[PDB]
Amino acid sequence: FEEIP
Amino acid sequence: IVEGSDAEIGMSPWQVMLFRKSPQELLCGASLISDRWVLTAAHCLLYPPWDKNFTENDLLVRIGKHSRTRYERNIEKISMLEKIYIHPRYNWRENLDRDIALMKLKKPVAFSDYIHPVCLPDRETAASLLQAGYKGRVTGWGNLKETGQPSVLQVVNLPIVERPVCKDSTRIRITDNMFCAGYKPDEGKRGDACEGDSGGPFVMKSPFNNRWYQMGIVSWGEGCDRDGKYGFYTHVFRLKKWIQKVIDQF
Amino acid sequence: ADCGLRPLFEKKSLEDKTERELLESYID
Ligand SMILES: COc1ccc(CN2C(=O)[C@H]3[C@@H]([C@H]2C(C)C)[C@@H]2CCCN2[C@H]3c2ccc(C(=N)N)cc2)cc1
Ligand SMILES: [Ca+2]
Ligand code: NA
């Protein structure tokens, strides 16, 4: 998963 | 979803991803039923045989998503949980009876092209639509095969199966709070939910008022897309008195 | 009041690629 801000 | 296809943009705007914070992973599907309430399977939050017992702080709700792994900037919304409500008679000890849970969000989510609530059926909706042969729709970011993972949300349409056929396919005791769906060996077509999809919605489009209704929740199965087996779903209408009681009280 | 009506489909009177399959199964 791409990191969440 | 096994033997499904890529969803269209905005095809399932009620679709919710339940996302574990640490480590980062897909936990389950779920659905948006109002600006503040999310519906899922109880087994997504509580299953003591596998030491599963999530608290509100363990997970996040991601809404309006299409891509499985990407952070969909300016599109998806990320929400925190205020409180989890598990059906008090959820039977994880025997046969997973009443496999249903609610999550109240810390703040209401704004609706958009990509984010919009599904309807819940009433008695008449359930009587009209919950018939053997009638097809509903299952969506999720789960496994593509029993034994990888999709780039985008997957969709499959599946027929409701006669209760005797559901009963005869399994050694498990089936209750009135469950139904099963899927194609038979002789039908040639295929498709099922799988790991990652559970908790997600089984929906039907009423031909009387052209609205989508969530008739089922992805509950349990034996493998995924096996010949002679069917996916089992929580019967949403049968549990609606509980849903209403929780929303009315809290 | 607006539940179950999709902004990108029912709201603008567009159909998705497989919703007809569902309608065709509702034979009563
Ligand atoms: C009726 O009694 C039971 C039947 C099956 C199971 C095993 N389980 C399932 O089938 C679902 C659940 C697990 C548990 C945690 C519910 C896990 C968590 C991730 C996915 N998996 C669920 C699951 C749900 C649907 C299908 C399917 N339609 N093939 C296959 C699996 C456990 C109890
Ligand atoms: Ca049996
Ligand atoms: Na099957």
Side-chain angles (χ1 to χ4, degrees), chain A, chain B residues 1-69 71-250, chain C:
Chain A
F1 291 86
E2 184 180 2
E3 292 286 318
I4 61 198
Chain B
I1 306 284
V2 183
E3 291 279 333
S5 63
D6 287 2
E8 286 161 78
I9 301 303
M11 200 194 205
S12 191
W14 33 83
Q15 196 78 210
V16 175
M17 175 183 296
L18 304 186
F19 184 73
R20 187 184 199 158
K21 288 193 194 178
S22 300
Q24 287 193 130
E25 56 188 39
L26 168 69
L27 284 183
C28 263
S31 63
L32 188 67
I33 59 168
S34 74
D35 68 351
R36 197 88 186 254
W37 288 94
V38 175
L39 184 66
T40 190
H43 78 259
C44 287
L45 303 163
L46 178 71
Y47 195 66
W50 297 357
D51 296 292
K52 179 192 286 189
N53 190 10
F54 291 116
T55 200
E56 289 71 8
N57 273 209
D58 290 338
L59 57 137
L60 295 167
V61 150
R62 311 174 66 164
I63 320 169
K65 286 190 69 45
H66 179 70
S67 173
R68 182 177 60 90
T69 60
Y71 174 62
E72 296 178 286
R73 186 163 53 96
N74 300 355
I75 296 178
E76 64 168 291
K77 290 302 177 308
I78 301 184
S79 308
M80 289 171 62
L81 304 187
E82 178 187 304
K83 192 67 183 160
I84 289 158
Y85 304 87
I86 300 159
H87 195 292
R89 304 186 69 195
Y90 166 47
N91 195 357
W92 55 266
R93 290 180 178 275
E94 182 191 9
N95 61 352
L96 222 62
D97 195 23
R98 306 186 193 86
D99 186 15
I100 190 161
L102 285 161
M103 300 173 287
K104 190 184 191 216
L105 308 180
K106 276 199 185 173
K107 304 206 280 185
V109 74
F111 299 165
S112 74
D113 282 348
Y114 315 105
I115 302 183
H116 199 88
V118 72
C119 303
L120 298 181
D122 61 22
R123 186 171 305 278
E124 295 59 63
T125 320
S128 302
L129 301 182
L130 283 170
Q131 294 194 233
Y134 282 34
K135 288 167 181 185
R137 178 179 283 174
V138 181
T139 44
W141 289 280
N143 282 9
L144 298 171
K145 288 190 177 175
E146 181 179 329
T147 306
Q149 308 197 293
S151 172
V152 309
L153 185 68
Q154 298 297 106
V155 57
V156 69
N157 301 327
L158 300 171
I160 299 159
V161 179
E162 294 84 355
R163 300 195 68 84
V165 182
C166 296
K167 191 181 178 295
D168 286 344
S169 74
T170 184
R171 303 170 66 162
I172 299 293
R173 181 180 74 83
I174 306 318
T175 74
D176 290 353
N177 301 318
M178 307 171 191
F179 68 89
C180 91
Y183 295 100
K184 303 168 183 176
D186 285 352
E187 287 179 311
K189 300 178 184 196
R190 313 194 63 86
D192 196 4
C194 206
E195 186 172 333
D197 297 317
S198 68
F202 177 101
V203 301
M204 298 175 86
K205 180 162 176 176
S206 170
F208 306 90
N209 69 0
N210 290 347
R211 292 179 190 254
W212 297 86
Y213 287 89
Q214 181 170 175
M215 310 304 293
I217 303 165
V218 181
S219 184
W220 67 273
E222 298 172 288
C224 313
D225 198 46
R226 294 194 195 159
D227 280 354
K229 302 292 176 150
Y230 303 91
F232 282 79
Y233 296 81
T234 311
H235 198 300
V236 170
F237 174 68
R238 287 261 312 168
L239 293 159
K240 200 193 179 169
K241 267 202 187 188
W242 175 79
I243 295 171
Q244 194 62 60
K245 171 170 173 172
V246 170
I247 291 166
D248 286 354
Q249 187 176 345
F250 302 104
Chain C
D2 204 11
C3 72
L5 301 173
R6 300 173 292 183
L8 295 173
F9 295 95
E10 290 78 16
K11 184 177 176 176
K12 65 197 293 187
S13 185
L14 289 178
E15 282 171 32
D16 73 48
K17 288 162 181 169
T18 68
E19 63 171 274
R20 192 179 289 289
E21 184 185 357
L22 304 185
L23 178 58
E24 291 174 343
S25 74
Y26 310 150
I27 58 171
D28 292 283

